[PDB]
Amino acid sequence: MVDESDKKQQTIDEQSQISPEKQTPNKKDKKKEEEEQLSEEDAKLKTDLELLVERLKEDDSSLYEASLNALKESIKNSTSSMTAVPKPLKFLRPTYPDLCSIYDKWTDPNLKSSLADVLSILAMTYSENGKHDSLRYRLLSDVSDFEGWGHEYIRHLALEIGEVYNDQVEKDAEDETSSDGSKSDGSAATSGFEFSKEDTLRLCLDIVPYFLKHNGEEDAVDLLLEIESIDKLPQFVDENTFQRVCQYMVACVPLLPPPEDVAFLKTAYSIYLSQNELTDAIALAVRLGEEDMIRSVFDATSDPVMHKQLAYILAAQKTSFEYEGVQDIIGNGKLSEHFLYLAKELNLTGPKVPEDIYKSHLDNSKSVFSSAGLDSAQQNLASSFVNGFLNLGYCNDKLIVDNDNWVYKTKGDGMTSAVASIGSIYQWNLDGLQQLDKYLYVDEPEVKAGALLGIGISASGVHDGEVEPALLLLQDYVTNPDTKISSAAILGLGIAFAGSKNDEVLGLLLPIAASTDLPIETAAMASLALAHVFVGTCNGDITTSIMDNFLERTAIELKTDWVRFLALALGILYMGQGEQVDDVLETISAIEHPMTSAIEVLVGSCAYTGTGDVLLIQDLLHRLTPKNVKGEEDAEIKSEEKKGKSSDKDATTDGKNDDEEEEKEAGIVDELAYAVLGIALIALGEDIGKEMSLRHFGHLMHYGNEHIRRMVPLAMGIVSVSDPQMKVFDTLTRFSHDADLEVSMNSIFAMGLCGAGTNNARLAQLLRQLASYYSREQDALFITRLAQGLLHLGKGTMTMDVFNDAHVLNKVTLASILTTAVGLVSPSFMLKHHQLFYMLNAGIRPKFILALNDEGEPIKVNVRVGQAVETVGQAGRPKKITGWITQSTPVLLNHGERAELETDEY
Amino acid sequence: NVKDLKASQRVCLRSDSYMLHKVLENKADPLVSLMMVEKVPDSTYDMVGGLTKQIKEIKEVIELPVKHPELFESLGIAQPKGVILYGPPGTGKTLLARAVAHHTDCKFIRVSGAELVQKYIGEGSRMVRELFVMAREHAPSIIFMDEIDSIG
Amino acid sequence: GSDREVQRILIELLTQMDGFDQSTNVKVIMATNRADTLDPALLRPGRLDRKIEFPSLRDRRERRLIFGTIASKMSLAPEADLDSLIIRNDSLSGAVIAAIMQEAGLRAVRKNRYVILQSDLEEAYATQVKTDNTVDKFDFYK
Amino acid sequence: RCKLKLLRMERIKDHLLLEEEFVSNSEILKPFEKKQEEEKKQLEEIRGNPLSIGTLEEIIDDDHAIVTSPTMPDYYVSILSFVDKELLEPGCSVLLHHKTMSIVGVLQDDADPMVSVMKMDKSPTESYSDIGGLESQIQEIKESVELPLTHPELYEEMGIKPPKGVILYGAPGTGKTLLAKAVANQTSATFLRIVGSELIQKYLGDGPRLCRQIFKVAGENAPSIVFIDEIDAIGTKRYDSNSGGEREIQRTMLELLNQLDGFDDRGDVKVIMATNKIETLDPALIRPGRIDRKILFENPDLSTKKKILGIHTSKMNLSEDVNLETLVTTKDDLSGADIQAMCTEAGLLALRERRMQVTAEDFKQAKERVMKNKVEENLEGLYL
Ligand SMILES: Nc1ncnc2c1ncn2[C@@H]1O[C@H](COP(=O)(O)OP(=O)(O)OP(=O)(O)O)[C@@H](O)[C@H]1O
Ligand SMILES: Nc1ncnc2c1ncn2[C@@H]1O[C@H](COP(=O)(O)OP(=O)(O)O)[C@@H](O)[C@H]1O
Ligand SMILES: [Mg+2]
Numbered sequence A: 001m002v003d004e005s006d007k008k009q010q011t012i013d014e015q016s017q018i019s020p021e022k023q024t025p026n027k028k029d030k031k032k033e034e035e036e037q038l039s040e041e042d043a044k045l046k047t048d049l050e051l052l053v054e055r056l057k058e059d060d061s062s063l064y065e066a067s068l069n070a071l072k073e074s075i076k077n078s079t080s081s082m083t084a085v086p087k088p089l090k091f092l093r094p095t096y097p098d099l100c101s102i103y104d105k106w107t108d109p110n111l112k113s114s115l116a117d118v119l120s121i122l123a124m125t126y127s128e129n130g131k132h133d134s135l136r137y138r139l140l141s142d143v144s145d146f147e148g149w150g151h152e153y154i155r156h157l158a159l160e161i162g163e164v165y166n167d168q169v170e171k172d173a174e175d176e177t178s179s180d181g182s183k184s185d186g187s188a189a190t191s192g193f194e195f196s197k198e199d200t201l202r203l204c205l206d207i208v209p210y211f212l213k214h215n216g217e218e219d220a221v222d223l224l225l226e227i228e229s230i231d232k233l234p235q236f237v238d239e240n241t242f243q244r245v246c247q248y249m250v251a252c253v254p255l256l257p258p259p260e261d262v263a264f265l266k267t268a269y270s271i272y273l274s275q276n277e278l279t280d281a282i283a284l285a286v287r288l289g290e291e292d293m294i295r296s297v298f299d300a301t302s303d304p305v306m307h308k309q310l311a312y313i314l315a316a317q318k319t320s321f322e323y324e325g326v327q328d329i330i331g332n333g334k335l336s337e338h339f340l341y342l343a344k345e346l347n348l349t350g351p352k353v354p355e356d357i358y359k360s361h362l363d364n365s366k367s368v369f370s371s372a373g374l375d376s377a378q379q380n381l382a383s384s385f386v387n388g389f390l391n392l393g394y395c396n397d398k399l400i401v402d403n404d405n406w407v408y409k410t411k412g413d414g415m416t417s418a419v420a421s422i423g424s425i426y427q428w429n430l431d432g433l434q435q436l437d438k439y440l441y442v443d444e445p446e447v448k449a450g451a452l453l454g455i456g457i458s459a460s461g462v463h464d465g466e467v468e469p470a471l472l473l474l475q476d477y478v479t480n481p482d483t484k485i486s487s488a489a490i491l492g493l494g495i496a497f498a499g500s501k502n503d504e505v506l507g508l509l510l511p512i513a514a515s516t517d518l519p520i521e522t523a524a525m526a527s528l529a530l531a532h533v534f535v536g537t538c539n540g541d542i543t544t545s546i547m548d549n550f551l552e553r554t555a556i557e558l559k560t561d562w563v564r565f566l567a568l569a570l571g572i573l574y575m576g577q578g579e580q581v582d583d584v585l586e587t588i589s590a591i592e593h594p595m596t597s598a599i600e601v602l603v604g605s606c607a608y609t610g611t612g613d614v615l616l617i618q619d620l621l622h623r624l625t626p627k628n629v630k631g632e633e634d635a636e637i638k639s640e641e642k643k644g645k646s647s648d649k650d651a652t653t654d655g656k657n658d659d660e661e662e663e664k665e666a667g668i669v670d671e672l673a674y675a676v677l678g679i680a681l682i683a684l685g686e687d688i689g690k691e692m693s694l695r696h697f698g699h700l701m702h703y704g705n706e707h708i709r710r711m712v713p714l715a716m717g718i719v720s721v722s723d724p725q726m727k728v729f730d731t732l733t734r735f736s737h738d739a740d741l742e743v744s745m746n747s748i749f750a751m752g753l754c755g756a757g758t759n760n761a762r763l764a765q766l767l768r769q770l771a772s773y774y775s776r777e778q779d780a781l782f783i784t785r786l787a788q789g790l791l792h793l794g795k796g797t798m799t800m801d802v803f804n805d806a807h808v809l810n811k812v813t814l815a816s817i818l819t820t821a822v823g824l825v826s827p828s829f830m831l832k833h834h835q836l837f838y839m840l841n842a843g844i845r846p847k848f849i850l851a852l853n854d855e856g857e858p859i860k861v862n863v864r865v866g867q868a869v870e871t872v873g874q875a876g877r878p879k880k881i882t883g884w885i886t887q888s889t890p891v892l893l894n895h896g897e898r899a900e901l902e903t904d905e906y
Numbered sequence B: 001n002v003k004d005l006k007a008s009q010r011v012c013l014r015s016d017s018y019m020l021h022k023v024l025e026n027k028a029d030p031l032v033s034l035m036m037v038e039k040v041p042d043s044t045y046d047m048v049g050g051l052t053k054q055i056k057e058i059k060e061v062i063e064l065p066v067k068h069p070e071l072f073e074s075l076g077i078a079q080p081k082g083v084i085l086y087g088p089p090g091t092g093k094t095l096l097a098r099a100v101a102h103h104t105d106c107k108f109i110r111v112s113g114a115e116l117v118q119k120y121i122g123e124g125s126r127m128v129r130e131l132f133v134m135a136r137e138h139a140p141s142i143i144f145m146d147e148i149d150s151i152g
Numbered sequence C: 001g002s003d004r005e006v007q008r009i010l011i012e013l014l015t016q017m018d019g020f021d022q023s024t025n026v027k028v029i030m031a032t033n034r035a036d037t038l039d040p041a042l043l044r045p046g047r048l049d050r051k052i053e054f055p056s057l058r059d060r061r062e063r064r065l066i067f068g069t070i071a072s073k074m075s076l077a078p079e080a081d082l083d084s085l086i087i088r089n090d091s092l093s094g095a096v097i098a099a100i101m102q103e104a105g106l107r108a109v110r111k112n113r114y115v116i117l118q119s120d121l122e123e124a125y126a127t128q129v130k131t132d133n134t135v136d137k138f139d140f141y142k
Numbered sequence D: 001r002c003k004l005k006l007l008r009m010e011r012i013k014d015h016l017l018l019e020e021e022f023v024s025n026s027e028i029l030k031p032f033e034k035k036q037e038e039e040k041k042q043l044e045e046i047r048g049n050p051l052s053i054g055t056l057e058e059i060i061d062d063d064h065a066i067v068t069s070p071t072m073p074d075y076y077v078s079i080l081s082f083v084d085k086e087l088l089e090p091g092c093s094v095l096l097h098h099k100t101m102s103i104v105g106v107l108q109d110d111a112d113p114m115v116s117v118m119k120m121d122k123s124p125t126e127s128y129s130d131i132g133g134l135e136s137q138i139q140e141i142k143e144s145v146e147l148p149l150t151h152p153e154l155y156e157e158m159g160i161k162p163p164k165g166v167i168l169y170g171a172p173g174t175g176k177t178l179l180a181k182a183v184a185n186q187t188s189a190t191f192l193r194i195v196g197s198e199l200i201q202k203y204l205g206d207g208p209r210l211c212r213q214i215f216k217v218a219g220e221n222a223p224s225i226v227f228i229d230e231i232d233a234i235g236t237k238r239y240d241s242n243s244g245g246e247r248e249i250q251r252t253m254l255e256l257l258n259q260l261d262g263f264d265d266r267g268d269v270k271v272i273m274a275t276n277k278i279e280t281l282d283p284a285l286i287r288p289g290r291i292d293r294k295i296l297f298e299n300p301d302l303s304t305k306k307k308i309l310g311i312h313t314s315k316m317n318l319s320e321d322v323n324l325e326t327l328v329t330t331k332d333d334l335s336g337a338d339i340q341a342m343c344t345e346a347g348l349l350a351l352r353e354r355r356m357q358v359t360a361e362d363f364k365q366a367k368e369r370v371m372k373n374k375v376e377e378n379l380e381g382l383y384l
């Protein structure tokens, strides 16, 4: 410690701990003496530096602070910061950390404030040489790590940081902002940013992500594209690069409103396309939703090879993943152009082969039938629906369908829903259509109408590739001047195709769904089908839907129910977008009826999703308003008002649901509590609002894919025996369906308890009966994610009919909708050129440890399992590939995605 | 109201229904009950001086992660758990544990095998957690479990 | 419930002892038969500093005095001697020396005599003698 | 690092929940609705002013009960009986009326400080694969502990009863302690943890009541996993020999047999026992069907230690100097707690310096301190 003159190196380390005589007197006196001594100081600069390096290992603040205290003065006292500019500019190298020792390594608010400014200025000027960039570099990649630089070096980077952020907020902007007095433009600091970026990229990741977003421009991300794509293999592995790219997008979502967010995802797509994994390219291009990029990744495998090679099998798989099927239609027609075998390739791109593997899985699963049956009442109507509710997904129950007796013993609308549940027995299958034709060509038109709903459900398995399309059959029934037939026909068309876009389907629904001049309450089905068809792409928010909403208000305002169904359809049509939804929000609001305000608040949910942190408070101020106005005054109408109250509650939960999927993967945790307290607000406020909200609770859980499926629906159930409107129970089971007889062993009993136990009318009893069978399928036949799976961040297209039914009071008519249960996830099985219908092995991981990514990524440890497992849901979602050890290489990665597997054997 | 009220705070009652009148101007603390009844002071290092080497060894491992656990987190080190003081009795083994508690600003809780300190549980096989928990309430603390290892 | 009554009294003692300090009083005198009824805090200095032992062993000059004080009170005969009591046992308590002399004053009345004879005085020693094999005239460890 | 944005996002979800919660409580919790007002009114009309805590000894099925109050006198109390005649049971705390003592109501729950030791508030900051290594004898503890809670569906395909019980045994320091605490973070079901030196007491009669209790609480919450750490401690720890001894130890074991399986048919109590004195246990304890798959742990082998040592040095500062492979060479079938004490003592060398770099020198030096422990309670030098 104490001085021990310069007689050995050990004592020079101690000499500068008390007071250097090599930097304090000498340099100071020299500089304020002759101006030809700059040739002496340049050598004595080197002497100064060594002492920093040696004392850039000593923890204590005092013997770095005090030793260099009078040097901090010399910056302005003797060196003057600039005189003969290069020499005094180059003598800031040792003095710059001196400024930091009082800025950072001591707190005196007066000296910290003033020297923030000074550090920023002298850093800006001294990075023109790039020797300030070199000064940062030796602390970035330290000499021998110690406390000091672990706090000081953050301050260097923060000067540039703050500045770029300040350029958006202020109206003074870079050197006219005096919080830094440095410019972010030029070729003096802009070259300092780039030079810093290369250095901090090599070993770490520090200011690199942070520069991009503070500019706000996709130009910034493209500057990094160049540097990284060289660094992709040699300076660090591909994998590390992939983690860099996705970490930028997923992290900054609440910092990227819709117009910013898409612009950032384009560059990400380009970095992948530069890199080897075309498997990464497809996932991100679907996220953008641009048809062009889908074709581009497909072309990347197709164009190079003049043969079928792994490349064409892989292209077909990449498009197969989307059960929306927007990809499927696109890739089928590229293949005809290229011309190889048609028979295997088009099917494989389409959802046909997914029919095939469901059969392989069914054979293992088995079939179970446990339905009740008693004649003559709502208890008979319930029983016949129940049999299909137990046979959801492709199951074998041929014989039960063949007995047409019970079909006829249902009456009125009951017949329609009876044939509709028959369709779900062969959901996603080429059969069914044979038994259905019987009803379609015989007795009352009601069974003919229910047949069309069942056609849609069965046609989910094949509609892309243009083999057995539902349109071909279903067009005639729309022409037919009967309302039951036409409304049922177009509802099945939307299920059948999916979010797939086809000209004949999409354009069929444009004439009608602008023909809302006709007063018809079952013409809602027109917009509901249209919404499901349209979503899957970055929406243009087509104008036929916008206009037909206005026309319907004009014709009728004494039928609030029809316009309530239709309102939901508008908001879901727009979902899959947030840019264009800002536009239509303002439009709806131009025309103002209190009936119109219902449409506005639902549409606000879609508009702001991507942050939805402004959205949630919006749907709470709205709650305040009715009561607010009444006090202010003091110091036919029926339908419009009833609509007003109901929409507001639906919207609030609706907002929560879109947000938690698009941004978070773990805030799903927080989202439950809002609903408990939110329903509690209403419980102790409007009784009318309570009716909607009970149902909404069940679908909040289902949409977000909450993690605890055991405790929550059941805990709610006991309360909901007392509360009116038993459709709450149906929505709870949508969530619990998860994997069957994992959650659902509790479910049947619990829903059976309130149904058998209580009697409060025979209208209520039906809904309770149905709920139990919906939940269970034999041996966990399938799982439902509302998410696309490919992206858990994606929102569904076929699962939106589950989402749809909570804003409306329960009726037999809504009971017809519920026979549909699509949203399905495929069971992943490894594939080959000859088509293997089983898996080999997989790894699954319940708990990650990574918080540098929202979900982390499964490390190479997982619990190993064998063949023949459906995709595992929450509490099992991270899924790793086990195929490496058998001398096979996966071509199609896995994370918990819906995607099928394919492998290549050496 | 109940938010002005809390566990282990003495109130005033108007005793014909026991209707709460005021909070009391007192509050009991149970950790002081044990510390007092044992009755041990705290110290500085000028009441231990002479084994000054030992003061360095204990300052390193105990005091520095109280004042700055930040350094240990960067280091990635699981902080010291059990620290043995041992030697001939009366060599200031005890007074050094006192001296640190004043400087670390911990409650010096001398445990000695006694149960007179307790009158509400009365054994240490049902007061290990509760002992730890009181030092949690009144944190930080220095739990001087003196095991002589000749008792009985 | 019964033990928590015992303890609540002892706590008050300890606490009143703290208050008692730096006063011109003598802090409490107390005795105990044994040394295994103490609590660690009761024995601790600041409540109890001093530990005045009483040994039974005492030395040759002190057994003399203690026989000698109990002979000051009572009558003896010139035949009786207190110097024949040193040679016998060398670990007695002060109560047993007050005991033998009282026991010899009953044997004296069986003779019907008011002066203690040395016949009386040795017989009384022989009863309640509490013999040792560590004391003089009983040894081969020499 | 670079997780700032997601933590702000989580925080942002927290701001929104705190906000809407607070305002909802404040003034728009509107108790101007009659189903709130009228229910509390006539509920307070029979409900006290002083509520006279009592203790219910037993019930009679004529709408009466006998309470014994802790103040003293018993009473033969009535029951207002809007409180559900059959919902209250011996051991309840009941609210008596300040006038004629009637059961105004019933308190749902009450607790002991002796079950505070049992129950836990913790949420470990370690999750599994901070047990990285020994990764196939840990499929015997997440296929019979974790999995039937996660999927009973798999055990329904085969049918018959699902797994029950494990005993962990092996050398000390080979991870037994952290194994139990790592499945409890995954499963998220009531994790009870009780030390075996508290099951040994210096008072008799209360020994058995403690042991009987653990599983009665455990069954009472439908899922629970009971970690009995150190059931090797029941024959080596004992106080006095006139209220401890053979007798104390025999009884407690006897109790545990009834509890562990016996005839209780209590709730789910998956059991985890750590031990390395497995031959001081009964043959009706280590009997099958209370132990189903039992796990043996021995010291890792050379390539297993490489897995262990890389887990431990990821938390530390590194250099290119550091070489893990030669630290492995020196050790030969030692515990992973020894490896773990080298990395902990390596930063103690860095603490000693007050230099925040960790280097190959720091790991090798603490290696010698670790080997000083093994062979210097030894005094042979070379095997005599
Ligand atoms: N196989 C392993 N894989 C990863 N970490 C390990 C392994 N073995 C030991 N460790 C580390 O060593 C630690 C010390 O272990 P712990 O104290 O839990 O060991 P133990 O075997 O339970 O000791 P005891 O023998 O005293 O019962 C653990 O906390 C753990 O992080
Ligand atoms: N280093 C010291 N400085 C001053 N006093 C000391 C020192 N070491 C021991 N003592 C004295 O010795 C006594 C014994 O101290 P304590 O710490 O209670 O001993 P033990 O090691 O037996 O627990 C006290 O009276 C105390 O003042
Ligand atoms: Mg001591």
Ligand SMILES: [Mg+2]
Binding pocket: D176, D177, D229
């Ligand atoms: Mg242990």
